[model samples]
Target chain A: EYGYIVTDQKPLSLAAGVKLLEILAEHVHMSSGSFINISVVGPALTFRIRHNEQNLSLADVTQQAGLVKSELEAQTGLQILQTGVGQRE
Target chain B: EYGYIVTDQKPLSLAAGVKLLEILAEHVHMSSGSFINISVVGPALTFRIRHNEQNLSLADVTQQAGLVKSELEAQTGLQILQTGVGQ
Candidate 1:
């Protein structure tokens, strides 16, 4: 399970949103076949990245997610205003 | 932003999936107005919980997500076989 960084205050373009996920996928070392859901809801870009198994600790995951957030912000000039996590079982 | 926990190996029914989000919202003190995306893709249930600003750490979020996973498994009698965090 993982936490999320939501970028909506500035509202990224569709292309930028997809690119963000693509960059994040590579950042997290996700494979090409991995399933990533990117949804543009109103003014927000919400997405979740799913992988088979990574056995990463919560701290590690958070740090990686944070790093990606920072990179995306710097790349697109959009601030991630909110954050949360979800799970499936 | 946050990481995610995906559950699919033993796919949850639609009703259970919704209930899981509802429970998670309550667990994290999220208001009902917050947006939660729950998608049932093939055999997997992928969902995200979004909050305005709780100032919670990554560890807190993960622990909370894990707690929900544990509670849901206990309530629904399903096992969370794999765990991964996605941002």
Candidate 2:
């Protein structure tokens, strides 16, 4: 399953966005290599997770996304507006 | 400037995902209409903000996102892995 979180804040720059992704990777105990794709979508940052070690459920993804959103907000002082999980395809 | 959070868990169903979005909207004090786009990517649910009110900064968004994450986890009994803000 797939999960994502949306925020109202924009990254300061491309470099900054990349840095944020790195921080997120660490929070979930994921190595940088685990992320399959990372890109910018309009005013948001989009990323994909490789189905490597474990099979995560939609609930698990949403929960993890929630934690990620909270931690990011605390670290960066931004507000997350939306988050959820869906099918991989 | 944009920010996104990634997760490893999946939703139970499409209806469940939509419900999750509604919960998130309430957490951030945003009306349902504030959301622009909502879709599913491989193992992920993606949504867009319409920039309706309060020209928020990266810091503000991240902070709110953080709170939302915590609330969701508590509500769903899920664990969060990663979270941070970007440029």
Candidate 3:
């Protein structure tokens, strides 16, 4: 019921990626009171969504990402353009 | 240049995931006229957009996905529910 996917470009800049991971972990912790496993590679970032947790659709995730992108830009004073794709879930 | 992310649920039904992979492979093949490797794992599916291949923006990829999603829904009578989150 779970797996991984890769993307064309680094989904987020180093700073942005780290911050977003932190936010996501917080959300997971708040929602389910559990810390999620998050990691980043050069340009690709990965995280796991546990079966017990609520699933965020790709569309909703991307929307939240836009919000994060805006916040990161404001925080770092750089517009870090990032884009990504997903299989289904 | 390459890595992976996992989603909370199986992204697609086994049948739908397989079909979406086939279409993506076709796009990659047509775009570069080269066969691109693709794979599906339970619900999460993965494919690589090569360094040399023209990069497809997240918006573009998701749009193409909507098209494919519609097609898949039509071809099969089953409404496959799938959702995901990425870090």
Kindly provide the TM-score of model 2 when superposed on the true structure, using C-alpha atoms: 0.40
Per-candidate DockQ versus the true complex? 0.07, 0.03, 0.20
Residue-level lDDT tens digits of model 3 in A1-79? 1112223334545555556555644543434223245555665554444444456643444445555666644654444
Instruction: Say which candidate scores most in DockQ.
Output: 3
lDDT tens digits, residue span B1-87, model 2 = 233344546533444445555666687777766654565444344455676576643334445656678776666544444443323
Cα lDDT over the full model 1: 0.56
Alpha carbon lDDT at A33, candidate 1: 35
Off by over 4 Å in 1: A1-89, B1-5, B8-11, B32-35, B56-62
Query: Which has the higher TM-score value, candidate number 2 or candidate number 3?
Result: 2
C-alpha lDDT of residue B26 in model 2:
80
Per-model TM against the reference: 0.41, 0.40, 0.33
Ranking by lDDT: 1, 2, 3
User: 2 or 3, which is superior by DockQ?
Assistant: 3
Candidate 1 lDDT tens digits, B1-87: 323444554555776556655666677887633535656554445554454698654335546757677786776555655443344
Residue A58, candidate 2: alpha-carbon lDDT: 33
Q: After superposition, how far is residue B29 of candidate 2 from its true place, in Å?
A: 37
Task: Report lDDT per candidate.
Answer: 0.56, 0.54, 0.44
lDDT of 1 by residue, A1-89 (tens): 43445676555577766666566556766652353565655446655445447644434444575756778677766676655454433
lDDT preference between candidates 2 and 3, better one: 2
Question: What lDDT does candidate 2 reach at residue B32?
Answer: 60
